[model samples]
Target: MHHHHHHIEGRHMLRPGDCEVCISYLGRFYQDLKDRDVTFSPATIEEELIKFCREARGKENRLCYYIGATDDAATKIINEVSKPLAHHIPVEKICEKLKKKDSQICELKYDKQIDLSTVDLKKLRVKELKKILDDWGEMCKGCAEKSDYIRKINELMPKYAPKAASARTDL
Candidate 1:
């Protein structure tokens, strides 16, 4: 079997070869930004990204490439950082842009056809209902202001309506 090692500042450590470039670049980026503020650092950002990837991994989702690509995009954005923006702008704004880019990348990861037929409208909360429509993007447009998004979803996906609840006379 082939083995891989990660190198950081001449130090080597054995770890799984999953999104290696993203892991490394994020470290460097964090190092560059950590000293700038109390709320921001590459390590913190990378940790969050890794945690997200791990959760997706738990679901057997392949998002390393997508994450790696987003990291590369974030690197360019952060590279534009300078004394002016670094000193004056809010840290949250910078982080928000990076996360937005990452979210854009996430769009690609969820590009496969979703089985809305399995969706249970009765159990769906407003937040999840909005998320599903957001994920569907253009296909789900015109539903944001509709009185019944769930009803619209059922129209888009036959059999998506939840079954009627059984009556309990004892109640």
Candidate 2:
């Protein structure tokens, strides 16, 4: 029998901004992972990311109340992660909802394909959404740097194909 071993070297926080709001923040981050296609169970995801931090690192790592303290993008990122799981939300609705709270969201317009408002933030935060990012983050540069989340986006670009165009064809 052959076994493949994976060891996490440095600590990886898929969305390294700030999780001061905790639950929702954790939820948003988890949602991002799903959006990226890093499939996993909610139990595993919570255990690996939010729960572990709460258990081992204390409240700072908790996702529920930790995210609000963070600034701009960090707050947005965390909110997006939390949306589907926290309130049974949809990604597309997040921007509008958050926009009501965080007006800046309106200024940062995204294309139809790039829009995240359509996702259900409430559902994505399910404890069942395992921490695939805990392991998968190492492979994703953008998630690590916290500047952009292009890792999985690039990987899934093929899905955006025009159906008959070569530039948009899926690999």
Candidate 3:
């Protein structure tokens, strides 16, 4: 109904239900159509939104499913979102509506991305260092100071860094 008076925008920066990836991706999706001046018709918007879904990954992929754009979705309430969206509705309200339809849409939370880069290595504490290495089933006999922990970790980095390790060092 048009009587709804909920307004989190003036004071609150983020209503807790919003996930960083989900909020930004919808805004990004809208901005793309806005840039090209896509027709505001819900049909046009729905088709464009579906085409946009091809690039989605991880949490964003699940969002596409909840919006009924993906091949596996059971319902096509995508119109429920697309209509309001074509009118330039706030991404939050569309999410709130979708949350009522399928709570999975709001429940898709992003993981706390690991800072795998070495800059954070110097910033890491020795105590935390001990735990990480221990969990890796590694021992550092050469360790003395925090620097030594970093040195030992960098050495072992090539062994268990997974992405940074496996991407190379193999024939």
Candidate 4:
């Protein structure tokens, strides 16, 4: 039997196997432990399970935040994990057991999309601007440098044009 150690959010926790994936992988470990007639301290197992559930809940919450907390997103996440596992299971026996087990742990969700249209690109550093542009898929071939992206964004959203030099000479 193998002991699994996971370091999540800075704290390290030990488990026979935590989530469905780990549990699936560690099935042999648990079976071996059971066959050997070994046992874990009830107190320790209780605490470990609690910690595992807490971590699982946090992950689910984050996933929901990323995808926009919705039932559809949760279903998609569930299917995404189960689909591959099903192929390995049985054709006649379906993966209902695994899916049911996984579902009990936590539910996935979504978050809001990033919006950069209202941002003031002029004040941002080149690297910062590039990162934002890259994240939004706004970087194009023509944008060879930061200036190009600035020009493109200016063309698309025109922050402010030159006052024709003589139009304003307060300086």
- lDDT agreement with native, every candidate: 0.40, 0.39, 0.61, 0.38
Estimate, for each residue in 1-171, the C-alpha lDDT of model 4 and write its tens digit: 999896655325645433422233224323443454434433333233233323443333333322222343333233332233234432111224433644432221121323443332223356645665554456445545777766655664422334434345645
- Ranked by lDDT from best down, the candidates are 3, 1, 2, 4
The window of 10 residues in a row where model 1 has the poorest summed lDDT is 57-66
lDDT of 3 by residue, 59-114 (tens): 55656755677565546467766777766674755566666765544544332334
Q: Residues 108-164, candidate 1, lDDT per residue (tens digit)?
A: 334343454233222235655665655554354434743476566657553332233
Question: Candidate 3: deviation at residue 65, Å?
Answer: 0.9
Error of 1 at 98 (Å): 9.1
Judge candidate 1 against the unseen true structure and give its global Cα lDDT, from 0 to 1: 0.40
RMSD of each predicted structure: 17.5, 18.0, 14.1, 19.2
Evaluate residue 70 in candidate 4 and report its C-alpha lDDT on the 0 to 100 scale.
35
Off by over 4 Å in 4: 1-123, 139-143, 158-171
- List the candidates' TM-scores in order: 0.19, 0.21, 0.44, 0.19
Listed per model in order, the count of residue pairs whose N, CA or C atoms clash below 3 Å is: 1, 60, 0, 10
State, as a TM-score between 0 and 1, how close model 4 is to the true structure. 0.19
* Pairs of residues at least 3 apart in sequence or in different chains that clash in candidate 1: 30-42
